[PDB]
Ligand binder design. Structure first.
Ligand SMILES: OCc1cn([C@@H]2CCCN(c3ncnc4[nH]ccc34)C2)nn1
Length: 167
Protein backbone atom coordinates (compact mmCIF):
# COMPACT_ATOMS: atom_id res chain seq x y z
CA UNK A 1 0.00 0.00 0.00
CA UNK A 2 1.22 3.53 -0.85
CA UNK A 3 -0.17 7.08 -0.43
CA UNK A 4 -0.96 7.91 -4.08
CA UNK A 5 -4.67 8.80 -4.33
CA UNK A 6 -7.22 9.24 -7.13
CA UNK A 7 -5.26 7.44 -9.87
CA UNK A 8 -6.82 5.37 -12.62
CA UNK A 9 -5.10 1.99 -12.98
CA UNK A 10 -3.98 1.36 -16.58
CA UNK A 11 -1.99 -1.85 -16.07
CA UNK A 12 -0.50 -4.01 -13.33
CA UNK A 13 2.13 -1.32 -12.68
CA UNK A 14 1.09 1.96 -14.39
CA UNK A 15 -1.35 4.48 -12.90
CA UNK A 16 -2.45 7.89 -14.22
CA UNK A 17 -4.07 11.05 -12.85
CA UNK A 18 -4.96 14.56 -14.03
CA UNK A 19 -2.73 16.47 -11.64
CA UNK A 20 -0.05 19.12 -11.35
CA UNK A 21 3.11 17.12 -10.63
CA UNK A 22 4.38 19.95 -8.39
CA UNK A 23 1.26 19.86 -6.21
CA UNK A 24 1.23 16.07 -6.22
CA UNK A 25 4.86 15.89 -5.13
CA UNK A 26 4.22 18.46 -2.38
CA UNK A 27 1.40 16.34 -0.98
CA UNK A 28 2.78 12.79 -1.36
CA UNK A 29 6.50 13.52 -0.79
CA UNK A 30 7.33 10.43 -2.89
CA UNK A 31 10.65 8.65 -2.68
CA UNK A 32 11.27 9.59 -6.34
CA UNK A 33 9.87 12.39 -8.50
CA UNK A 34 10.92 12.32 -12.16
CA UNK A 35 11.96 15.54 -13.86
CA UNK A 36 11.62 16.05 -17.61
CA UNK A 37 15.22 17.21 -17.89
CA UNK A 38 17.50 18.27 -20.71
CA UNK A 39 21.15 17.23 -21.00
CA UNK A 40 22.35 20.51 -19.44
CA UNK A 41 19.92 20.30 -16.51
CA UNK A 42 18.75 23.81 -17.43
CA UNK A 43 15.32 23.81 -15.84
CA UNK A 44 13.79 26.70 -17.74
CA UNK A 45 10.25 25.66 -18.62
CA UNK A 46 7.75 22.87 -18.86
CA UNK A 47 7.80 20.37 -16.02
CA UNK A 48 11.43 21.18 -15.22
CA UNK A 49 10.83 24.90 -14.88
CA UNK A 50 7.84 24.23 -12.64
CA UNK A 51 9.66 21.74 -10.40
CA UNK A 52 12.66 24.03 -10.10
CA UNK A 53 10.49 27.06 -9.28
CA UNK A 54 8.83 25.05 -6.48
CA UNK A 55 12.31 24.43 -4.96
CA UNK A 56 13.05 28.19 -4.96
CA UNK A 57 15.83 27.50 -7.55
CA UNK A 58 17.67 25.06 -5.25
CA UNK A 59 17.24 22.35 -7.90
CA UNK A 60 19.02 24.58 -10.46
CA UNK A 61 21.87 25.41 -8.05
CA UNK A 62 22.44 21.71 -7.33
CA UNK A 63 22.16 20.89 -11.03
CA UNK A 64 24.74 23.49 -12.06
CA UNK A 65 27.25 21.95 -9.64
CA UNK A 66 26.44 18.48 -11.03
CA UNK A 67 27.11 19.61 -14.61
CA UNK A 68 30.28 21.47 -13.67
CA UNK A 69 31.62 18.21 -12.19
CA UNK A 70 30.24 15.60 -14.58
CA UNK A 71 29.36 17.31 -17.85
CA UNK A 72 26.06 16.89 -19.69
CA UNK A 73 23.80 13.88 -19.56
CA UNK A 74 23.07 11.72 -22.60
CA UNK A 75 19.73 11.91 -24.37
CA UNK A 76 18.00 8.84 -22.95
CA UNK A 77 20.05 9.06 -19.75
CA UNK A 78 19.43 10.19 -16.20
CA UNK A 79 20.93 11.17 -12.89
CA UNK A 80 19.66 11.02 -9.31
CA UNK A 81 19.82 14.27 -7.36
CA UNK A 82 18.01 15.66 -4.33
CA UNK A 83 14.25 15.96 -4.32
CA UNK A 84 14.55 19.10 -2.18
CA UNK A 85 11.15 19.98 -0.65
CA UNK A 86 9.26 17.85 -3.20
CA UNK A 87 10.53 14.26 -2.77
CA UNK A 88 13.41 12.33 -1.27
CA UNK A 89 15.11 12.13 -4.68
CA UNK A 90 14.64 13.63 -8.12
CA UNK A 91 15.40 11.36 -11.06
CA UNK A 92 16.32 13.75 -13.88
CA UNK A 93 15.52 11.86 -17.10
CA UNK A 94 16.29 13.18 -20.59
CA UNK A 95 13.74 12.17 -23.17
CA UNK A 96 14.37 13.12 -26.79
CA UNK A 97 13.23 16.63 -27.74
CA UNK A 98 11.49 16.45 -31.11
CA UNK A 99 11.86 20.22 -31.43
CA UNK A 100 15.64 19.56 -31.50
CA UNK A 101 15.43 16.69 -34.01
CA UNK A 102 16.35 13.95 -31.53
CA UNK A 103 15.58 10.32 -32.32
CA UNK A 104 12.23 9.26 -30.86
CA UNK A 105 13.54 5.71 -30.43
CA UNK A 106 15.55 7.12 -27.52
CA UNK A 107 12.26 7.44 -25.64
CA UNK A 108 12.39 3.75 -24.69
CA UNK A 109 15.93 4.16 -23.33
CA UNK A 110 14.73 7.16 -21.31
CA UNK A 111 11.91 5.17 -19.70
CA UNK A 112 14.30 2.30 -18.88
CA UNK A 113 15.80 4.56 -16.21
CA UNK A 114 12.53 4.24 -14.26
CA UNK A 115 13.19 0.50 -13.74
CA UNK A 116 15.98 1.34 -11.27
CA UNK A 117 13.34 2.66 -8.81
CA UNK A 118 10.56 0.61 -7.24
CA UNK A 119 8.01 3.46 -7.17
CA UNK A 120 8.02 6.83 -8.98
CA UNK A 121 5.87 9.90 -9.54
CA UNK A 122 6.51 11.01 -13.12
CA UNK A 123 5.36 13.03 -16.13
CA UNK A 124 5.06 11.58 -19.60
CA UNK A 125 8.56 11.77 -21.06
CA UNK A 126 9.08 13.84 -24.20
CA UNK A 127 5.53 15.27 -23.93
CA UNK A 128 4.67 18.95 -23.63
CA UNK A 129 7.40 21.27 -24.90
CA UNK A 130 9.57 18.27 -25.85
CA UNK A 131 7.26 17.82 -28.83
CA UNK A 132 6.43 14.11 -28.86
CA UNK A 133 2.95 12.63 -29.10
CA UNK A 134 1.83 11.97 -25.49
CA UNK A 135 -0.25 8.97 -26.59
CA UNK A 136 2.95 7.40 -27.94
CA UNK A 137 4.83 8.32 -24.79
CA UNK A 138 2.22 6.55 -22.66
CA UNK A 139 2.45 3.45 -24.86
CA UNK A 140 6.25 3.34 -24.53
CA UNK A 141 5.93 3.87 -20.77
CA UNK A 142 3.53 0.94 -20.37
CA UNK A 143 5.65 -1.30 -22.61
CA UNK A 144 8.98 -0.39 -20.93
CA UNK A 145 8.52 0.43 -17.25
CA UNK A 146 8.08 -2.60 -15.00
CA UNK A 147 8.26 -0.78 -11.66
CA UNK A 148 5.31 1.10 -10.19
CA UNK A 149 4.81 4.43 -11.93
CA UNK A 150 2.25 7.11 -11.05
CA UNK A 151 1.86 9.45 -14.02
CA UNK A 152 0.71 13.04 -13.50
CA UNK A 153 -0.83 14.72 -16.55
CA UNK A 154 -1.31 18.47 -16.12
CA UNK A 155 -3.79 19.08 -18.93
CA UNK A 156 -7.29 17.75 -18.25
CA UNK A 157 -8.16 17.60 -21.95
CA UNK A 158 -5.06 15.50 -22.67
CA UNK A 159 -5.66 13.27 -19.64
CA UNK A 160 -9.13 12.38 -20.94
CA UNK A 161 -7.74 11.69 -24.42
CA UNK A 162 -4.98 9.45 -23.00
CA UNK A 163 -7.48 7.40 -20.98
CA UNK A 164 -10.11 7.19 -23.72
CA UNK A 165 -7.57 6.06 -26.34
CA UNK A 166 -5.63 3.63 -24.13
CA UNK A 167 -5.40 0.09 -25.44
O1 LIG B 1 -0.95 20.80 -22.44
C1 LIG B 1 -0.33 21.30 -21.29
C2 LIG B 1 0.76 20.32 -20.88
C3 LIG B 1 2.12 20.50 -21.06
N1 LIG B 1 2.71 19.44 -20.58
C4 LIG B 1 4.20 19.22 -20.56
C5 LIG B 1 4.55 17.99 -21.17
C6 LIG B 1 4.97 16.92 -20.26
C7 LIG B 1 4.12 16.84 -18.99
N2 LIG B 1 3.97 18.18 -18.29
C8 LIG B 1 3.59 18.25 -16.89
N3 LIG B 1 3.16 17.13 -16.33
C9 LIG B 1 2.79 17.12 -15.06
N4 LIG B 1 2.83 18.21 -14.34
C10 LIG B 1 3.25 19.40 -14.82
N5 LIG B 1 3.36 20.62 -14.22
C11 LIG B 1 3.82 21.48 -15.11
C12 LIG B 1 4.00 20.81 -16.31
C13 LIG B 1 3.64 19.46 -16.13
C14 LIG B 1 4.67 19.27 -19.10
N6 LIG B 1 1.79 18.58 -20.09
N7 LIG B 1 0.56 19.14 -20.29
Amino acid sequence: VNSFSGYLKLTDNVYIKNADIVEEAKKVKPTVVVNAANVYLKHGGGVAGALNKATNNAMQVESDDYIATNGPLKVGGSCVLSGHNLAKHCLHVVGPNVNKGEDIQLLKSAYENFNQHEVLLAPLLSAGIFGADPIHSLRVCVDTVRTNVYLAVFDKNLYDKLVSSFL
